[PDB]
Every structure is written in structure tokens, then in C-alpha cells.
Amino acid sequence: VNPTVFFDIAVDGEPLGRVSFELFADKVPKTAENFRALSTGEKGFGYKGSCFHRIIPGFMCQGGDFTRHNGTGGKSIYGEKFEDENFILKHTGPGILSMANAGPNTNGSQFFICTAKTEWLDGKHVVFGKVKEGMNIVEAMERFGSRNGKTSKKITIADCGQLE
Numbered sequence: 369v370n371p372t373v374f375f376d377i378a379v380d381g382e383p384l385g386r387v388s389f390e391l392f393a394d395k396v397p398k399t400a401e402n403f404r405a406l407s408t409g410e411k412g413f414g415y416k417g418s419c420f421h422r423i424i425p426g427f428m429c430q431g432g433d434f435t436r437h438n439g440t441g442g443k444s445i446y447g448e449k450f451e452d453e454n455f456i457l458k459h460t461g462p463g464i465l466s467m468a469n470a471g472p473n474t475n476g477s478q479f480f481i482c483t484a485k486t487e488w489l490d491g492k493h494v495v496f497g498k499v500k501e502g503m504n505i506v507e508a509m510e511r512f513g514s515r516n517g518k519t520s521k522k523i524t525i526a527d528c529g530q531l532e
Contacts, residue, residue: 373404413434430468433478459495464495
């Protein structure tokens with residue numbers, strides 16, 4: 369019953385591969401639905417065509433800013449920001465999907481895929497999904513990142529939607 373969402377990733381316009389995610393709609397329903405709707409674009413906006421603006425190898429890949437493409441923008445389906453739904457799920461290793469924020473109850477559309485165990489984020493960032501297929505694609509994305517987060521090539525969501 370948990371939805372599965374796909375991203376097709378492109379590096380400088382050249383296809384790279386497909387990552388799919390399970391969204392914990394049972395454990396965090398308000399958070400998951402935000403991500404699901406932004407991935408299908410069914411509300412008229414969303415992730416299709418947006419980039420991964422910050423990639424730090426051995427830490428995480430961060431994306432979802434579809435309005436300013438640099439970490440300062442984005443918005444949720446509910447409005448500019450929404451609350452921290454709960455912190456039931458923890459950052460337990462690579463593949464975890466978690467919300468970026470700027471303080472309590474400031475979720476928008478930005479997210480990060482963890483490429484490490486990031487336990488110091490527990491209780492501050494809402495975990496809402498996990499990579500199901502294509503962890504190897506995420507590892508390939510990581511190699512375009514750098515220590516300060518700047519990417520050497522443009523990493524874009526060329527297409528995205530719901531698989532089930």
C-alpha cells in the first residue's frame with residue numbers, strides 16, 4: 369500500500385539511470401503525500417526538470433528546490449512550509465529519504481538522500497522514505513559531488529512519477 373515513486377536521473381542531459389523510492393505513507397502520511405504529489409506533478413508543479421544542487425560524497429545528495437535551483441527555494445503542496453509531522457523514523461544508513469528544513473516546522477519541497485548513517489539528524493529532520501531500487505545510481509551521482517557540495521556536472525531529474 370506504500371507508494372513507490374521514480375526519478376530518472378540525467379547528468380549534463382545524458383541519461384544516467386533510475387532510482388525508485390518507497391514512501392512511508394503509513395508512518396508519515398502528510399509528508400509522504402507531499403513528495404508523491406510533487407513527483408507526479410499532479411498539482412501543477414513539482415520535481416520534473418529540477419536539479420540536485422548539493423552533493424557531498426559520503427554524506428548525502430540534496431535536491432527539490434524547483435523554484436530557485438540552489439537551496440533557497442521550493443514549496444510544498446500545502447503552502448510555503450508545513451510542520452514536522454513526527455520523528456518516528458531515524459537516519460539508519462544509506463538510502464534514507466529525509467526532509468531538509470531551516471528550523472522547526474519549516475518543511476517545503478527540499479529533501480536529501482543520505483549516503484551514510486546520519487544519526488545526528490534524528491529528531492530534527494523528518495524521515496519519510498527509502499531507496500528501493502537503484503541505490504547504485506545514487507552512488508554514481510555521489511561521484512559528481514565535492515566536499516563543499518558543488519557538483520561538477522548538472523544532475524537533473526529528467527522525469528519522475530509514480531510506479532505503484
